[PDB]
């Protein structure tokens, strides 16, 4: 059966980028409710949001108007400038001796384990880190190839919320190493923000957007169903159709991996056992 692991990373800093840390915190809450263990969830977030001077609700982060506090109970493995290419790629590879700073948590995975990666915070051929240097497609894909060569996982799902997201994988990500990638946008498109000041029932004294369109769409989907009854492929189709007006949700890698239920990666919340997913 193996263990479920996750790496959650917001690649930005600054209060204006509230939404990236909010999205990642939200994802944490999904995993926790699903039975995924903290020792197997590696979290990269700058940690300048919850107690920011501009934060009208100190100690709270929401990913939705009227939402719960997604910040409570979120482990922090790498914060501040310990979020960088070196530590991110070392964490994925599971190379503890290459980590500088932070907790030292890495993907020490076994052949039957499942890996879920979620990145939020892009341009053609690169995604952001809090500070330069940024993460280039080739560098990311090479780490993913090395990890595959180690054979230390069964399959991996990688979700990317970024501008031109598909550019990180397009024509690079191998299709037979059990890695499936879903991107908020194609290699030529920007991705949309949502939950901005002005929207109805928006909490007062917020001047920042709470989430990213593709992110909150998938994340709210994960909160809504028994995840044994919904596959990665069904979420792809659901979310792609739902936000087609905004950007083209794109997929890469080993497409058959997406035939697994979401629960294989995320578990399921027992409270949603009777909420069977409808459609495909
Ligand atoms: C709350 O959010 C604030 C805005 O995002 C954030 O302020 C920013 O603070 C950082 C770090 O203190 C500043 O960065 C500095 O460091 C580099 C060198 O590495 C300098 O070259 C920079 O010019 C600067 O001195 C940002 O300048 C600053 N940004 C703004 C717009 O003020 C606060 O730090 C956050 N507060 C908490 C509690 O996290
Ligand atoms: C892990 O990191 C160390 C320190 O930089 C390096 O010497 C070692 O070869 C790395 N392991 C692999 C196999 O990438
Ligand atoms: C974006 O995705 C579509 C769907 O297959 C594809 O035709 C296109 O080549 C990709 N990007 C563009 C507009 O070049």
């Amino acid at each position: 059966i193996g263990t479920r692991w996750a790496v959650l990373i917001a690649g930005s800093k600054g209060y204006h980028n509230y939404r990236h840390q909010a999205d990642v915190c939200h994802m944490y809450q999904i995993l926790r409710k699903g039975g995924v263990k903290d020792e197997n969830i590696i979290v990269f977030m700058y940690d300048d949001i919850a107690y920011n001077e501009s934060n009208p609700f100190p100690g709270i982060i929401i990913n939705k108007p009227g939402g719960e506090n997604v910040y409570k109970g979120v482990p922090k493995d790498y914060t501040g400038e310990d979020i960088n290419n070196v530590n991110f790629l070392a964490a994925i590879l599971g190379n503890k001796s290459a980590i500088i700073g932070g907790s030292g948590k890495v993907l020490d995975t076994s052949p039957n384990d499942h890996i879920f990666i979620y990145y939020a915070x892009g341009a053609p051929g690169k995604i952001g880190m809090p500070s330069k240097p940024y993460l280039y497609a080739d560098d990311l894909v090479d780490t993913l190839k090395q990890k595959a060569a180690t054979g230390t996982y069964k399959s991996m799902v990688f979700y990317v919320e970024a501008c031109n997201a598909g550019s990180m994988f397009e024509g690079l990500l191998p299709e037979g190493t059990n890695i499936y990638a879903m991107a908020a946008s194609n290699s030529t498109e920007g991705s949309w923000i949502t939950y901005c000041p002005g929207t109805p029932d928006f909490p007062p004294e917020f001047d920042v957007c709470l989430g990213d369109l593709w992110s909150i769409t998938f994340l709210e989907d994960c909160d809504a169903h028994n995840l044994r009854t919904e596959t990665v492929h069904q979420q792809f189709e659901l979310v792609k159709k739902k936000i087609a007006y905004a950007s083209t949700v794109s997929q890469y890698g080993d497409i058959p991996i997406s035939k697994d239920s979401l629960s294989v990666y995320m578990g399921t919340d027992p409270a949603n056992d009777n909420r069977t997913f409808v459609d495909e």
Side-chain angles (χ1 to χ4, degrees):
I1 186 168
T3 305
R4 301 172 171 104
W5 298 72
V7 175
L8 309 182
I9 172 156
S12 65
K13 63 170 169 187
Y15 187 79
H16 80 286
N17 293 312
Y18 180 115
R19 67 196 179 279
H20 298 142
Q21 287 175 69
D23 298 338
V24 149
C25 286
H26 191 168
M27 189 64 231
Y28 170 76
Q29 300 297 339
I30 285 157
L31 294 177
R32 187 194 34 103
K33 267 175 306 200
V36 182
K37 294 288 173 298
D38 279 8
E39 49 268 27
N40 308 123
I41 306 166
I42 305 154
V43 179
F44 296 74
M45 51 178 196
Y46 204 86
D47 196 27
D48 52 354
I49 304 301
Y51 300 97
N52 201 267
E53 201 133 27
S54 314
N55 185 2
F57 301 108
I60 293 175
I61 302 179
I62 67 181
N63 196 38
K64 184 190 201 281
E68 72 166 36
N69 175 13
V70 287
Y71 179 78
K72 205 150 264 186
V74 179
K76 306 166 208 162
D77 294 296
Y78 305 90
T79 67
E81 292 297 326
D82 294 327
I83 312 172
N84 49 57
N85 293 342
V86 168
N87 288 336
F88 179 54
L89 300 179
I92 293 171
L93 218 60
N95 188 354
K96 204 190 279 292
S97 74
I99 293 290
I100 299 177
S103 69
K105 197 195 280 165
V106 299
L107 288 186
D108 277 328
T109 51
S110 293
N112 315 298
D113 291 343
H114 291 104
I115 302 174
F116 177 74
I117 305 188
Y118 173 51
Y119 175 99
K126 71 194 189 201
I127 56 188
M129 286 291 155
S131 302
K132 281 164 167 196
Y134 293 164
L135 185 54
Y136 286 73
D138 65 358
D139 191 13
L140 174 56
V141 168
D142 295 350
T143 302
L144 290 185
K145 286 174 175 172
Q146 291 172 51
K147 178 68 166 174
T150 78
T152 56
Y153 62 93
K154 196 242 181 70
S155 65
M156 176 200 291
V157 168
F158 204 137
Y159 278 22
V160 182
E161 171 74 68
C163 303
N164 312 97
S167 77
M168 292 299 282
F169 301 116
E170 196 165 271
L172 295 173
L173 182 63
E175 300 178 25
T177 62
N178 300 16
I179 308 180
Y180 170 84
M182 201 190 308
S185 61
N186 212 344
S187 55
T188 61
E189 298 165 343
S191 57
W192 281 42
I193 304 162
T194 202
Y195 293 149
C196 289
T199 71
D201 291 302
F202 201 76
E205 310 320 329
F206 270 90
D207 55 355
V208 295
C209 304
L210 303 184
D212 296 282
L213 183 63
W214 178 74
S215 287
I216 65 89
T217 306
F218 93 73
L219 290 161
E220 289 168 8
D221 181 55
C222 294
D223 282 328
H225 305 115
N226 182 339
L227 294 191
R228 298 192 190 97
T229 71
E230 187 185 356
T231 67
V232 176
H233 166 80
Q234 286 167 325
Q235 186 172 75
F236 169 72
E237 297 297 355
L238 184 150
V239 174
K240 177 177 159 66
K241 178 61 168 287
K242 178 79 165 291
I243 70 154
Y245 65 89
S247 67
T248 307
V249 181
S250 295
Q251 62 179 4
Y252 309 88
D254 200 320
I255 308 309
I257 293 305
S258 64
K259 296 307 163 74
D260 298 332
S261 295
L262 283 160
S263 63
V264 163
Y265 302 89
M266 294 177 186
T268 191
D269 180 4
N272 282 315
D273 277 328
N274 301 143
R275 308 266 163 109
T276 304
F277 177 75
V278 160
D279 240 11
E280 150 149 57

